[model samples]
Target: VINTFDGVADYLQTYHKLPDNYITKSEAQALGWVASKGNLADVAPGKSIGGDIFSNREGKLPGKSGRTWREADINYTSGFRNSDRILYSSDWLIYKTTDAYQTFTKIR
Candidate 1:
C-alpha cells in the first residue's frame, strides 16, 4: 500500500495520478463517511479521500493561473483523517500540508 509520504508522492510523480486506493469525497460520503466523525473505515474500509478539486481559496499554494489543483490524504490509518495531504495539479505540481491546508511545501 502506497500510503506513506513519499509513497503516494512518488506514485503521483511517476504516473501523474493517484493510487488505486484513493477515493473521492462524494464516493466516500455515499459509503456513509462523515468528515466530522471520520468514519471512513466504518464505511469504505482502506480507502483514502482524494480526487476532489482543491479551490486553493486561501491562496496558500503556488501557481495562481492555468492550474487546477486536486488533493489526497496522506498517511491515513483509520478513524480520523489527519491534516496531512498532498495537493497536486494535472500538470503534476505536488505539495504537502501537515496542518490541514494551513501551509504547503512543494515536493515535486
Candidate 2:
C-alpha cells in the first residue's frame, strides 16, 4: 500500500520504519509492505520482491527486464559435478554446472 502524507508535513527522518516514536511526513512514503519489512532491507538492491514480467513452469522468475541467471547447476555437456571447482554456465534457457570434490554453497 502506498501512502501519501497530507496533513502531516514533518516528523522524524526515517525509512522502512513506522511512525512509532516519530512523525515525519517526509519519511511516510509507504512502499511495499514486504519490502519495507526490514530497516536497511528496505532500500537494499535486489531486495524488492515486487513486480515481474513472467513466471515459468519451474517457478523461474524472468522478471520485468526479462533477465534471469542460473543460480545453480549440476549438469554439463562434458558431464556433471566431477572434479573440484564449481562451474556455472548461462546462455539463454540452458544452465550448466560442474564441480569436483566440493559442494557449491555460495552465490555471488
Candidate 3:
C-alpha cells in the first residue's frame, strides 16, 4: 500500500479517506477558476476542486436507498486535474479511479 503502483492507491491506503485538500467545483469556479488555467490561489485561498456531490446517474457503483456519493480529485497538486479521484459514499463505500469517471474499483 505504501509503495503501490498508483499514487492515488497509496494515498487511499495511507489515510483510508480523502486528503484534506479539496473544494467543490462551484466553490473554485465562484472564485474565478478557469479550466484552461489553474490559478486557484489568486482567487480563493487554500481551496481546490473537492467536497462535491457525485451523481451516480450511470449506476456504475453499488448503491442503496438514501446513499450519496462525494468525490475528491487525487494527486491534484495544482493546475488542471487529470482524472484520479476518490469516490466515497455515505455508507462508507470507497472507490478509486484514474480515468476520470470512466471506471472505479471499490476499496471498502
lDDT for each of the candidates?
0.77, 0.25, 0.63
Error of 1 at 19 (Å): 0.7
Candidate 3 lDDT over residue span 6-106, tens digit each: 44344544565545556688887786787787886555444446767866766777776656777776655435667766777666567877788778887
Which segments of candidate 3 are over 4 A away from where they belong? 1-19, 41-47, 55-57
Query: Which residue ranges in model 2 land beyond 4 Å of their true spot?
Result: 1-57, 60-64, 70-80, 83-106
Measured by TM-score, how close is model 2 to the native structure? 0.15
TM-score of 1: 0.83
Worst 10 residues of 3 by lDDT: 1-10
What would the C-alpha RMSD of candidate 2 be, to one decimal place? 20.1
lDDT (0-100) at residue 10 of candidate 1?
82
Task: Give lDDT tens digits, candidate 1, residues 1-108.
Answer: 456666777888887668878888888788778757878776656778888876666666665665677888888766778788888776777788898876788787
TM-scores for candidates 1 onward, in order: 0.83, 0.15, 0.70
Q: Which residue pairs show backbone clashes in model 2?
A: 11-23, 11-24, 81-99, 83-100, 84-100
lDDT by residue (32-104, candidate 2, tens digit) is 3233344323343222121112234343323333343322212212211123222111222322223442343
TM-score of the candidate numbered 3?
A: 0.70
